[PDB]
Design a protein around this ligand. Structure first.
Ligand code: ATP
Ligand code: ATP
Ligand code: ATP
Ligand code: ATP
Ligand code: CA
Ligand code: CA
Ligand code: CA
Ligand code: CA
Lengths: 145, 145, 145, 144
């Protein structure tokens, strides 16, 4: 019977992304699929070179919070029958970085995304990351709400 | 342990939609969910009352063809372990009708869609019916490519 | 001191598109630009070859109605200081045809569009033809509402 | 009929500056008021302990946006455009631009670049433009 083999679940810090992760674990268990959770630290903030260290302080703190969240997720997955969890934090423009991750790891056959994220839940029904990735992903994409 | 209960798969006459239907059957099998396939006959063409019978002839043929496709899908589904298939042909503006179907049958907890359809596979990676439904659906949506 | 030289105003049969045309003539007058109004007859309806005559009867009537609206538009432009009006009725998928038209005539340096059209004013603030054209046009695009 | 009040939201990109330049061209022809708006995006993830770090960053970005505004004020003085209001706000850009137009309902044109700082090698129209075209109460023109 036909199955997903390699799932990607991009997550920001939002409850909607965490609900997408939870469903991605459920999908991974059902299909006995590999699972990768990816947080992108957005590094595109305008700055002159003089402000490099202030930007690093901000992003490295964001990265550390994201790593603490991934550690809790690894513990959670160990209580399920999903076979594994790889966790990854990378820096870049989130939507581009998600697209490139999928395209440059072509074994990935599903992306699981929250409908919304940290910025726009009381303004749109679907955020611009989700919309972009739906558009540009080389594989199936499921939007969780 | 959450599972889908009632899956809606909107189909046009395209191969992309038929691939979406095949996956919806796989999801319905794995979840033992109810499945409904829905073809919308687009009835919005410009016409004066004098041309009603001409348009009616064209739309009635399209409907009949869609019903032929549906009969074949019922036969397919009987070769699988999916519980059932409800088949529906509706007249309306496709993206609005899909949205309304999901909102008006709120037990629907997944919509399955092809990325593209009959019109633009050669111009876009995601068609405007998909993009509309991803935005406006009250439930999870999965885009199949 | 740049000016437009060759403006395209795609119209459907909606009031919103006619308000677009009205503004296109205003822009045309100001820049002393050439103006082209383009109505696309959507010929993408599902039909087998036995049905071509039924479809053609529908499309020819739509085309004839469009031609009468163009006649009225030529009359209106002659009451203004806008240099001219070319009118065109084409057959194809509307958003594709508009894109192709602007690429076929690269002199075109503005496309003027209504925000919405005949199908979706009660569902969206901007229609799918307009968003497609904003995305895909090789030149500036103004949206009229 | 003519435009009375034009808003031209700008980021720091060349695209946006081309948008600004056309906005001046439109403003002169119509003898419309012109406002240029730069929104400092303040949505970065951060805990309270990091408030002052983010403040430092955003305040520098704001300051650069002001140097751009000053150079634009000087350009507009060379033209017969009636005026330039310059403004710098803090918030989510696309939301802020929408709010600005609905909170100043005299605005009858928004002029935008097709793309901006982040995505010209990925999309033909950016997400800020997309959102404003959709949510604006008035005409919107996309410059490319
Ligand atoms: N930085 C990121 N890293 C990884 N995944 C992300 C990131 N940002 C968003 N996502 C994924 O995309 C989903 C939707 O977030 P998105 O950014 O589209 O919404 P939003 O922030 O509410 O709106 P917008 O950013 O368009 O204002 C999230 O639930 C998450 O799954
Ligand atoms: N008339 C319809 N009835 C039911 N579902 C449809 C209909 N039209 C499209 N869909 C669904 O949406 C999916 C994508 O089709 P969509 O219409 O968005 O693409 P397209 O025809 O290529 O592009 P567009 O119509 O934007 O030019 C289809 O695979 C199908 O699942
Ligand atoms: N067939 C056409 N020929 C020329 N221009 C068109 C055509 N259809 C739409 N347009 C142009 O696009 C503008 C917006 O129409 P659009 O089709 O996007 O909106 P809609 O019909 O309300 O929504 P949708 O088709 O997405 O449901 C119109 O005001 C017109 O300028
Ligand atoms: N922070 C801002 N303040 C004011 N105007 C802006 C801002 N950001 C973008 N704009 C306006 O929107 C136009 C398009 O920028 P947009 O942000 O949509 O493109 P992008 O940065 O290339 O893509 P994206 O942000 O979707 O990755 C700009 O040229 C500018 O006119
Ligand atoms: Ca976001
Ligand atoms: Ca379609
Ligand atoms: Ca339309
Ligand atoms: Ca941007």
């Amino acid at each position: 019977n036909a199955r997903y083999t390699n799932i990607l679940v991009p997550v920001d810090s939002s409850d909607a992304a965490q609900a997408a992760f939870t469903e991605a674990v459920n999908i991974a268990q059902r299909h006995q699929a590999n699972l990768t959770a990816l947080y992108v630290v957005d590094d595109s903030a305008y700055h002159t070179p003089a402000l490099d260290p202030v930007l690093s302080e901000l992003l490295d703190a964001e990265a550390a919070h994201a790593k603490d969240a991934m550690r809790q997720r690894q513990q959670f997955v160990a209580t399920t029958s999903a076979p594994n969890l790889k966790t990854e934090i990378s820096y870049g423009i989130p939507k581009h970085t998600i697209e490139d991750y999928a395209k440059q790891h072509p074994e990935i056959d599903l992306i699981v995304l929250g409908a919304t994220g940290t910025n726009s839940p009381h303004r749109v029904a679907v955020g611009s990351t989700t919309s972009y990735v739906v558009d540009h992903a080389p594989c199936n994409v499921i939007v969780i709400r």
